[PDB]
Enzyme design. Structure first.
Site, short mmCIF file in Angstrom:
data_model
loop_
_atom_site.label_atom_id
_atom_site.label_comp_id
_atom_site.label_asym_id
_atom_site.label_seq_id
_atom_site.Cartn_x
_atom_site.Cartn_y
_atom_site.Cartn_z
N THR A 154 0.80 -1.22 0.00
CA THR A 154 0.00 0.00 0.00
C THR A 154 0.84 1.28 0.00
OG1 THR A 154 -0.21 -0.20 2.40
CG2 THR A 154 -2.01 -1.10 1.06
N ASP A 198 7.72 -11.54 -28.06
CA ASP A 198 8.84 -10.60 -27.95
C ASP A 198 10.03 -11.06 -28.78
OD1 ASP A 198 10.85 -8.76 -26.53
OD2 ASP A 198 9.02 -8.28 -25.44
N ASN A 202 6.10 4.38 -25.16
CA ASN A 202 7.11 5.19 -24.49
C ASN A 202 7.29 6.56 -25.14
OD1 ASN A 202 7.62 2.87 -22.89
ND2 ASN A 202 9.19 2.18 -24.35
N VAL A 248 -8.21 -5.16 -24.52
CA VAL A 248 -7.05 -5.72 -23.85
C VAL A 248 -6.65 -4.82 -22.68
CG1 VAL A 248 -6.32 -6.90 -25.95
CG2 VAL A 248 -5.34 -4.65 -25.37
N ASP A 283 -5.53 1.13 -18.85
CA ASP A 283 -6.30 0.46 -17.82
C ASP A 283 -5.63 0.47 -16.46
OD1 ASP A 283 -6.78 -1.43 -20.56
OD2 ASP A 283 -8.58 -0.91 -19.41
N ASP A 312 -2.70 7.27 -6.08
CA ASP A 312 -1.40 7.39 -5.44
C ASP A 312 -0.28 7.86 -6.37
OD1 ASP A 312 -2.35 6.67 -2.90
OD2 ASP A 312 -2.29 4.55 -3.42
#
Length: 279
Positions: free
Chosen positions: A16, A39, A161, A177, A200, A260
């Site tokens: 947390t 990959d 990125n 997805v 998401d 957060d």
């Protein structure tokens, strides 16, 4: 179970709060699940994989990872020291060459391969696919990711990125997805992480230690590193019976640490992957 002196990202996904260094997780550890890493390949001989990794498909002259990227991502999914789901089975699908590049047609073939190939594997707890790759928007790439998800695989994809809206990238922009942004050890959005309504979830993506080729290790950064945290988390939660491939992205968002992260643009979720494990 407790892993002391764990990589910060593993500690983060079971906490947390930022700033701790022990990873806590249920000892089932993804046993009975499978994760495909689509990959540059996986160095399955790395001691960190303990015989649980194997190459199942390549579109190039070798199935070996001559780059390192795929081995690093696989290590974050499931290596003994660097992995989220330390007992999952890892299956490598080499759609990217040893320079890290790949044609969309090959990537699409690899996704359709996984949707079928899972029927040749033993994954009683469920199947995940981790896609630390992407390029510009393509409806065909998005549709392939959607098919893979529809077939009963939890698909986790890197947001990208570009410090830009992920709506312009694929498979990041496919709604069905799980699109994963990157955060750092101080709970800041990673400087390079894409954002936008299509994300998401966020996972650890800056300065992530994992396996590398030549039996080595190194720390690198990217949404490519955040994605396998989420893929491994999904496999772990599916083994626990808490969710399914079709519902795992939503469950991870439901149970995430909320509000957060800093520097999350207005309109992007402020959700950080969290295993909710109570030791």
């Amino acid at each position: 179970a407790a892993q002391t002196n764990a990589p910060w990202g593993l500690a983060r996904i079971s906490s947390t709060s930022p700033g701790t260094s022990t990873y806590y997780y249920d000892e089932s550890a993804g046993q009975g699940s499978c994760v495909y890493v689509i990959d540059t390949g996986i160095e399955a001989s790395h001691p960190e994989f303990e015989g649980r990794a194997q190459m199942v498909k390549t579109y190039y002259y070798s199935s070996r990872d001559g780059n390192g990227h795929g081995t690093h991502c696989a290590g974050t999914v499931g290596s003994r020291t660097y992995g989220v789901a330390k007992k999952t089975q890892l299956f490598g699908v080499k759609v990217l060459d040893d320079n890290g590049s790949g044609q969309y047609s090959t990537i699409i073939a690899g996704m359709d391969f996984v949707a079928s190939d899972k029927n040749n594997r033993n994954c009683p707890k469920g199947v995940v696919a981790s896609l630390s790759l992407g390029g510009g928007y393509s409806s065909s790439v998005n549709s392939a990711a959607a098919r893979l998800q529809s077939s009963g695989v939890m698909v986790a994809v890197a947001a990208g990125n570009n410090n830009a809206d992920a709506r312009n990238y694929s498979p990041a922009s496919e709604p069905s997805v799980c699109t994963v942004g990157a955060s750092d050890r101080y709970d800041r959005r990673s400087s390079f992480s894409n954002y936008g309504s299509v994300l998401d979830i966020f996972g650890p993506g800056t300065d992530i230690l994992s396996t590398w080729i030549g039996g080595s290790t190194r720390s690198i950064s990217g949404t490519s590193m955040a994605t396998p945290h989420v893929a491994g988390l999904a496999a772990y939660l599916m083994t626990l019976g808490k969710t399914t491939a079709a519902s795992a992205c939503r469950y991870i968002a439901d149970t995430a640490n909320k509000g957060d992260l800093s520097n999350i643009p207005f309109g992007t979720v402020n959700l950080l992957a969290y295993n909710n494990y109570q030791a």
